[PDB]
């Protein structure tokens, strides 16, 4: 079932006082006239933010669960509520398949727990919440308002104040509700023109990009637009498909014949074998744990599998004792000066 | 490979975006790719099949909004500068040398220019937005003859204002 999300869902973006000014700001807001899913529960995606809202007559909804796998495998938010002590404990609790906590539930067998915080309690009354996660901060905004004999979103405009800025720093990837109607919506990045009257308490807003007339209005920061020609945006065509073309060749390079040679040459008379006309799969060498160090210069080690080169030479020699670090561009010492000297613009990697 | 569309291609590590079309530039056997005056590819030789593909950047341009004014109507026209109408409010489409104009109806009779658009075309009247070729002023002729002179019999005094910073 669906209903139409009205002009609801605007909140204070920055905690900065401003007065008598029209300020244009970009953040994640709920688009006007969006639908929002109506439920009468299953697990829903969290993506980039949720406009959770619910109406009721009593305190039937008592909590929320946030996490990634909800199986003690990752850290999971368990913000839960009770009559007078709201408790937040972000720990790897192992939750049941269908939690429904007069006794206690789903938060049993908590091996160890890392965070606890206490606040004053949250919950004919409409209760709006906004949950966003920005750079390691779980932010909740809320407002309570007297609803009347209406069976939907009550029409009109009201801004939401901040309540907590808990420093949890986890992902959160999926969500579920606890125990019966809700309005789940999703936020998207859109630009709004916000009107502050004089004490700073947002009095109006204009949703840009709604239509051609609305775009001119935001650009001029005015509610009336004079006669003329205005430049408002830039058109850019996006590509439709990718095409990958490569030379026809299936030969494999003898990497086993260089790294596993019976006897290596001395550093004063190092060997230089030329490898060509083959397919070189470098993912095994990258993942192989047998190497002590793997420092690549010039190219990053994980994109070297896509790029192509005309020829590669593998110079193999043995060095013992100190100075092993001297094999690098622009280095000095007995080894670099008399034994093996690398060019200044060398592009490649040394493995030892 | 798909031709005649803006695509993001990758030829042996050479990447870019453009429309790939047939060409008649006779590359000699020893050259593989040609470059512009700028350090970017102008054409390229395909592998496996050894053919010459031309690369032309896909079309782009600015968007301008034409509006009559808060005293008349909420209907507006949108001008896509320097783009053709053969690619994307959706009522009428008129192709001009200034770009592709959408939303304005073309009327054959000329009037004095009001809102300039460019390239000689100006553009509310008769319940709709109209576009037309601008008039240069009223046409009149003087009754020239080899033996007639006109002398004024009266005068008027006028006052003008000139403002300079």
């Amino acid at each position: 079932a669906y209903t139409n999300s009205f002009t609801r869902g605007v909140y204070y973006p920055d905690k900065v006082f401003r007065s008598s000014v029209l300020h244009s700001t970009q953040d994640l807001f709920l688009p006007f006239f969006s639908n929002v899913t109506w439920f009468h529960n299953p697990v829903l995606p969290f993506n980039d933010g949720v406009y959770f809202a619910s109406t009721e007559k009593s305190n039937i909804i008592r909590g929320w669960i946030f996490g990634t796998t909800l199986d003690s495998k990752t850290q999971s938010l368990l913000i839960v509520n009770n009559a007078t002590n709201v408790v937040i404990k972000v720990c790897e609790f192992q939750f049941c398949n269908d939690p429904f906590l007069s006794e206690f539930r789903v938060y049993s067998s908590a091996n160890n727990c890392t965070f606890e915080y206490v606040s004053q309690p949250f919950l004919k009354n409409l209760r709006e919440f906004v949950f966003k996660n920005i750079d390691g901060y779980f932010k909740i905004y809320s407002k309570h308002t007297p609803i009347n004999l209406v069976r939907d979103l009550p029409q009109g405009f009201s801004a939401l104040e901040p309540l907590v800025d808990l420093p949890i720093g986890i992902n959160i990837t999926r969500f579920q509700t606890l125990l019966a109607a809700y309005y789940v919506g999703y936020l998207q990045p859109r630009t709004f023109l916000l009107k502050y009257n004089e004490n700073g308490t947002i009095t109006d807003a204009v949703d840009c990009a709604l239509d051609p007339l609305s775009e001119t209005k935001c650009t001029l920061k005015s509610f009336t637009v004079e006669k003329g020609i205005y430049q408002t945006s830039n058109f850019r065509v996006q590509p439709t498909e990718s095409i990958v073309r490569f030379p026809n060749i299936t030969n494999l390079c003898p990497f086993g014949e260089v790294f596993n040679a019976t006897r290596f040459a001395s550093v004063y008379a190092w060997n230089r074998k030329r490898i060509s006309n083959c397919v070189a799969d470098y993912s095994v060498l990258y993942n192989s744990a047998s190497f002590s160090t793997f420092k690549c210069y010039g190219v990053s080690p994980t994109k070297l599998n896509d790029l192509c080169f005309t020829n590669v030479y593998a110079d193999s020699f043995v060095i013992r004792g100190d100075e092993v670090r001297q094999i690098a561009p622009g280095q000095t010492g007995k080894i670099a000066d008399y034994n093996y000297k690398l060019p200044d613009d060398f592009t490649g990697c040394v493995i030892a | 490979l798909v031709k005649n569309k803006c695509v993001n291609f990758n030829f042996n590590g050479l990447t870019g975006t453009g429309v790939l079309t047939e060409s008649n530039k006779k590359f000699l056997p020893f050259q593989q790719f040609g470059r512009d005056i700028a350090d970017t590819t102008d054409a390229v030789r395909d592998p496996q099949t050894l053919e010459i593909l031309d690369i032309t950047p896909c079309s782009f341009g600015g968007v301008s909004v034409i509006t009559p004014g808060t005293n008349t109507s909420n209907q507006v026209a949108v001008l896509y500068q320097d783009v053709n109408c053969t690619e994307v409010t959706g009522s009428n489409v008129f192709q001009t040398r200034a770009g592709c104009l959408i939303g304005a109806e073309h009327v054959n009779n000329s009037y004095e220019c009001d809102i300039p658009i460019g390239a000689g075309i100006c553009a509310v009247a008769s319940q709709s937005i109209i576009a037309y070729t601008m008039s240069l002023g009223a046409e009149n002729s003087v009754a020239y003859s080899n033996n007639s002179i006109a002398i004024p019999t009266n005068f008027t005094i006028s006052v003008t204002t000139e403002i300079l910073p």
């Epitope: 009109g156 405009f157 009095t203 709604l210 239509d211 | 909420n74």
Partner: antibody
Amino acid sequence: VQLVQSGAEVKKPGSSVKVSCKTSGGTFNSFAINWVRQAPGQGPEWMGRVIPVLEIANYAQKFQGRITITADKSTSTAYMELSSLTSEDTAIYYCARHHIAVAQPYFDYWGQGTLVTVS
Amino acid sequence: QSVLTQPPSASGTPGQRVTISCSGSSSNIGSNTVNWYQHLPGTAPKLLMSSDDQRPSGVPARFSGSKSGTSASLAISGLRSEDEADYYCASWDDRLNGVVFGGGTKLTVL
């Protein structure tokens, strides 16, 4: 643009009356239509509105299932019909338009109005 | 009855200034904007004042608005004969879930 309403109507109590308000071409989609009356010796009162592109309607709480507002896209005309006409329903009816990308309503252009008399 | 209360009558002398007021409650005026409409009988009304501090495109520099607490006012300078009309104040009401209009005032120029 302009809004053109139907002519004056004379009706008997207990009957039904239908009043239309025809608009321009672009005045649908991103525009709402509001209905306002003014009883003699009284202040103006709001009834409801309809968004043609969304076909969703709102009604004043005092009009409990007596008013229904509909609109069609093919002809570009909006309709109002009221049931159970009584003596106190005599007034002048207006249709006025709103811009949809503004949170707080503000009527911009008003129609000329029509007069309905009951006796 | 109109939720917003306005003085039934008001008068002013030519050439001077006059002030009109519109008083309401905390549920409508205190939380939402106000709008001012000019009405002449036999004709359609017009928008004088929008978002309670923002002037429209057409009206010239003279009409000014202000809002304070639960009361709002409109100021007219350079009063002239054609200003004879009715004035209405309107605002959204949260409790009634609809728009509520004022009672209207007759302004008389002596």
